[model samples]
Target chain A: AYAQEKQDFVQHFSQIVRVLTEHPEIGDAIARLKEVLEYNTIGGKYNRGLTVVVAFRELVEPRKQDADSLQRAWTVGWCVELLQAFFLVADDIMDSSLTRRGQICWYQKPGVGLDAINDANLLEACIYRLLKLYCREQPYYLNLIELFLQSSYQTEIGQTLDLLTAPQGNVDLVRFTEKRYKSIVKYKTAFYSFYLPIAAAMYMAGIDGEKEHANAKKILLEMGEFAQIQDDYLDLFGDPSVTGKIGTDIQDNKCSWLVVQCLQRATPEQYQILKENYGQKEAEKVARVKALYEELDLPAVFLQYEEDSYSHIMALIEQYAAPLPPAVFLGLARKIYK
Target chain B: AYAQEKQDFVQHFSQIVRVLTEHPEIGDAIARLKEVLEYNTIGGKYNRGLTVVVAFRELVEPRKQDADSLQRAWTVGWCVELLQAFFLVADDIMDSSLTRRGQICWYQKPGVGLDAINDANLLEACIYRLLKLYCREQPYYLNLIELFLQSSYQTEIGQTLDLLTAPQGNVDLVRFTEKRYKSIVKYKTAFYSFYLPIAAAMYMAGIDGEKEHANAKKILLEMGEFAQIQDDYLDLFGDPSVTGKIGTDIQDNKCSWLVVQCLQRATPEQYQILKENYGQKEAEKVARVKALYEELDLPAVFLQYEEDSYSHIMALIEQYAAPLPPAVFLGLARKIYK
Candidate 1:
């Protein structure tokens, strides 16, 4: 079902190119922006962007969501994808990632190297451009702009904290406390991933009051923290074919929740093993870290945590997904619970 | 007279830091943001930021200009500087510039390479944060937000074009036409430098009509273009001792006004010489390009162009500067004309 919606999304998204190119003033920036939109925004499974459309459809009555409103939702949804694209293009540069969505990272591509810096920003600029073009007449326009801006600020701060937690060439475990991990995930994942789409829908449905929006955030934000923790768990101990990628968080010196949990459980000698081997490039050292994880039964620990986190989310959905249909919360929960 | 007001601007700037820190939830982002603000936003001559205050003072009547209004103008002016700082910090990264304002660029600081990417954005975010803190209750709140947002998009688009015109390692001359040069500087420098501060003051002084602001932009933006072309001329040909530094536009493969004019006038052999020697790092090669420029009598052409440009700007100031005071136009002209 979503695959069909995803297909329509790319079809609808072609208008971004059309609108920008229609302006003789766009010049050659349109070509770079199109590539920027293509390489970074479209490749994802359309989870985040599609969620906006899907949730908005479910929330608002069909009649009021007029043709313009429908198109506006898709464009705004693409704005979220554009936001992600902007972040990922820059993030790939900062993280020095080798690939994104199965191609060489935009920044890592041969000639594209740090010019991706400006390209990343062009992706960001496109978001506001689309907002102005598609939704300027809407009352919700400024709200959406502020939403993306605040989310960008929060995510950047989270990324900053994540980088500082485990900087490259350092084995500092002092900063990877559980409190810090939750804080990072809250700003990093919850706002942009979970709450952003639902919030986008809420605004689209004209649910502009803070009290009810706050309730949706309470539910979705908690849901997001659980999903991120699970992602960190899967990064280390999960199946490759299932996860569809190598887990480089260990090698990258990322402040993974798994690592934080391991530190909490470690004795002094085991801590030494991790400290010496955790961030190294050698396979043998990586193997040692994995073996230590197994001996400490981190997989079993993860399973237990997953079990607990699942119930915690269920309770949150029950307690806080009020006033909005449970389906909104349930739709998001279903995406990650597996 | 202005120096004291500039000093007072920094004094009010503290509440920005205080507001961020007041939220314990801000956590580790506080220290990094504080550093980002202090290092990049300050240390400039306050030309852009002070323009807002000066323009506001000149435009608004005396009784309406209370202590709060004065402080608010200064803060909004700092918002402009904050916008410039945000772009400069990131632009330095894309350009790999070693220094800005006679100090190592923020991205070049020890242990702060890619981290400055996030730091640069934190500086941008501070603009909105300052806006929300100081201007939220004002009728012009959305106006300021939209102005800054639109200015940012235009500036980033210009930055995009400027970078595309001269990718660091490439020696493409096709992109640096006079048309492209004006487009680059018009978007890159003029929007923020001319329209942003003055337009900001216009909004603050209860002159929110589109037609008047459009008129202000027409005059100020013309002034901005001439100023930028002169900047490009000064970059290559002006005395280093007078300019306070050596010009790197020749060495940096910049899409400079001089280079654009050079390309426009180059014969086939001169074009070949430029293509071979323009972007090279070697001193001899750079000298060769400069020699070709001098051989082509670019200095005489530049002087002649400067006179024409001055005449054109004075005409614009006369035609468009009415409705608004001529002194505002002349004040900007005096800074650039010399």
Candidate 2:
């Protein structure tokens, strides 16, 4: 029954996805929007968007009879996707990313450089339009707007920190400890992706308690940080063909998990190897960095980190689990945990 | 008395301006913001920001009230300048402008490039923050947000058209007609520059009638287009050192007033001169284009356009001068004309 309902929710969201992607008046702007919407959004694991519906379902006692409830859940899920678009467009522009999800970055496309900023703004504006269209009559409309605005502000601040810390891997060795990485991930990636979904659900269910939302935030942010660390690991060491793209984190000088772990474990010779090979564009240079990761047993480190993180998160979830609903977090964990 | 009141308004606005410019968190962001803000917001012959205050004063009866009215007017005027900052940062990035006003464009400075997009977003986000800080208790808060948002959308759409219509100088001449130029200017410049100040004043004065606002918009947008056309004309013919910036509209292959006018009235020799010299970075080639403009008596043509456009706008303002304060338009015209 849950599977059938999930399918229905996805289908409903496709309708909204269609309207934005296929808007007629967009004309030439559509070209950039097409790449931005597709690469940053649809290709993303739908876990964040789906979490909204999952949380909403768990919050209801007897499964409300209102048809609009299902529709609203789907609409809110799409807002999550749109929020992702806002961040990804800005992220791609900032990171000087060549591609996303196996396609060219929207900014790199012809005639679409800084103008993509306006396109990103349009993606954000669509959220309010959708909210007003679907949820303005609902009691939670104002609450949802405030929630999204606060989340956006937090994420931008986190992005500001991330940009400062990791600009072309000019990392101050003094700041490269594990705790700082967790702080970066929590602020930059965790709040919007993990906490936002379930918080929107809580708002929709008319649960306004700050304590209840804080409880969910505490558990979900840990999951989010772990997920991002896994992402950092996968970017360098995961199967390129399975992940659907070649990893260039080393060449891009990203302070990813593999690099940080390798830095932590490197002997003098291994440290010299990293200094020589990091951020070089040549294939051989990139290969040398990857080879050093293998020598340093970085993949095993990541596996251990993942195992500990999962158990830690599950224990925390069990500790906080209450009338706030466990199915929400459980469903989220199942989707996010590779 | 009027000059004293205007002086007081300017003083109060400078206080708000200092707050915006002097934030501790600004660091690197402050340098870029100052460069763009100074070029686009200050160093202008026109005082659109100051005019917003003047118009608000005229719109309300008795010429003025206590300190509170003056404070409200100054706050709205600061918003006008902030909105301009919002547009200019993004505009410079979009135009690939090397300099604005007199100094090097903010984007061209080292460490700034595409990150200017986020900085522009920060400039825009600051608009809402200022509004909430100063005007949230006012009855017109929602109206102000809605107006700013809708105006931004219109300007973005206009910019979209402007970018598409003149992707580069190599774009087919078929797209460089008078009609296309009008469309671009109307959306790109008029909404924010011409209408925004007066519309903001109307809101400040509690003038909420749709008919009244529509009449105000009808006149202001035409004035905005005339102002931009003047800018385009000045780009080629104005004293470069006096303008305090080198003109690159020709070299950048921008669709400027001179090009459109020449296209409308070029002899075969003039056409050849344009094809060879337009977009040429070399000094001699650019001089050749200027010579053609001299031969064509472009200055006289610009004078005629200025005379004709000013009259047309004045006549329109007169037609709609009922149930709305005539001084609103008159106050705006005095600033623009001076």
Candidate 3:
């Protein structure tokens, strides 16, 4: 039922796409907007949006009139996706990333560079428009606006920290320690991706107490951190063609979990090889780095890390299970781990 | 009285500047922020900030409450300047501009290229922080936030229009028409820079009706358009060194007031010269383009435009004078014209 509602919501959203694209005066802006929305929204597995529905389901009373509640849930869910679009457009521009979800990045496409930045701003503005249009008369309107703004600020700060610590061409390995990596992943990726969806749901359901929200954030944030680490591991180990794109962590000089782990386990000779070959764009040089990963038994180490992270997250879910509904955690875990 | 208040307000704002700079972890972010604030805020004589104080003077019941109102006015006025910093940073990065206010453009500085986009976001976030800190308990907190957000959207849309019509490297003279130029100027430069200050003052004074605020926006937007045209004229005809930098609208392929006017007046031979030398970076080619401006008598045309725009604005100010405060318009006019 929720899935059908989301489909209708997306169809309604097609108006925005048409309004942006078909206006002759705004043709270029709409074209840029299309690329940004496609790259950032269409490709990501819809876990963030799904969480909104899941939380809404759990929060709504079992025997209550929810005619507009489902519609509101889906609209807010789309907002989560839109917010993600905002961050990704800016991120792709900042990272100079070449591809996203198997296609050329919005910023990298011919004739559409840097202007995509404004499109990102447009995506953000659309969220408020949607909220005002659909949810203004609802009791939770102000709360949703506040949540959206605060989450945006948190995510931006995280992006700021990530940019500062891992600027291109300034690769001091000392800065990419485990603690810094954790901080970056947790703030940069987790809060908005994991915490925002569930929190938005909580507000919509009128679960406004501080204690309940904190518990949910605590659990979801830990799960988000684990998911990012899994992404880091998969960057090199996952099948590149099947994953739909190649990972450039080594070439892009990202402070990934794989590199930091390699650093911890490396002998002097291995450490020297790691430093010399890291961030090299040439294929042969990247292959040399991959070969070192095999020598360090990184696959087995990743297996262990995945198991430990999963267990840690499960333990957190259990600790917070009494206060929160079970389906929220179960639904989130099933979506992320699968 | 307003002048004394302006001096005190500038001193208080120094504290914000100081706190932002002292944090080294965000030092690069702070540096970028300072460049934007300095270029967009300090470079302008403080007319917009002063308009706030003057408006408050007329609106406040007891004149003795002027001191607190002045601080509020200054805080709100500085917020407008900060908002400009936000757009300018992103605008420079988008336009690939290399200089602003006669100095190396923030984005073109050695360590600050695309990072300016993020820096621009930071500048926007600071405005809210100042608003919440100083004005949250006030009656108009949400009003101010909404005003800033809506103005930002208008400016972004305006920028989108300008970039689409006048894309770098696609010098189609047809895009440089009078109607397109007005749209770009009103959307990109005027809304945030001119109208935002006074609208903000109206909100703080408890005038929330849309009709009254719309009147203020209408008059202020015209003022904003004139200010932008004046700026475009100055870039070409003003003393380069005293303007604190050289002009590159011709070589950089900008859609400036002078170029549009020249296009309107250009004979076939003159149009050929414009097409040939407009964006040429070579010294001789740039010099040749300037010579055409001399032959076209652009400086004299700019004088005519200034006089025409001034008279047009004064007429509007007269019509709106009964409902709106005269001091607000007079104060802003003094600051912008000089």
**lDDT of all predictions, in order shown?**
0.81, 0.73, 0.75
lDDT of 1 by residue, B52-120 (tens): 888898899999999888878878998899899889888887776666675688888887888888788
- Which model, 1 or 3, shows the larger lDDT? 1
Q: For this target, which candidate reaches the highest DockQ against the unseen true structure?
A: 1
Clash statistics: count for each candidate? 0, 0, 1
Best of the candidates, lDDT? 1
lDDT of model 3, residue B264: 85
What class would a CAPRI assessor give candidate 1's docking? medium
| Pairs that clash in candidate 2 | none
Off by over 4 Å in 3: A1-12, A16-40, A62-67, A242-244, A280-282, B1-7, B17-47, B62-72, B279-283
Candidates in order, TM-scores: namely 0.94, 0.85, 0.91
Q: Which has the higher lDDT value, candidate number 1 or candidate number 2?
A: 1
Ranking by DockQ: 1, 3, 2
Q: Give the Å shift of residue B85 in candidate 3.
A: 0.9
Q: What is the alpha-carbon interface RMSD for each candidate? A: 1.7, 4.0, 3.1
* TM-score of model 3 (CA atoms): 0.91
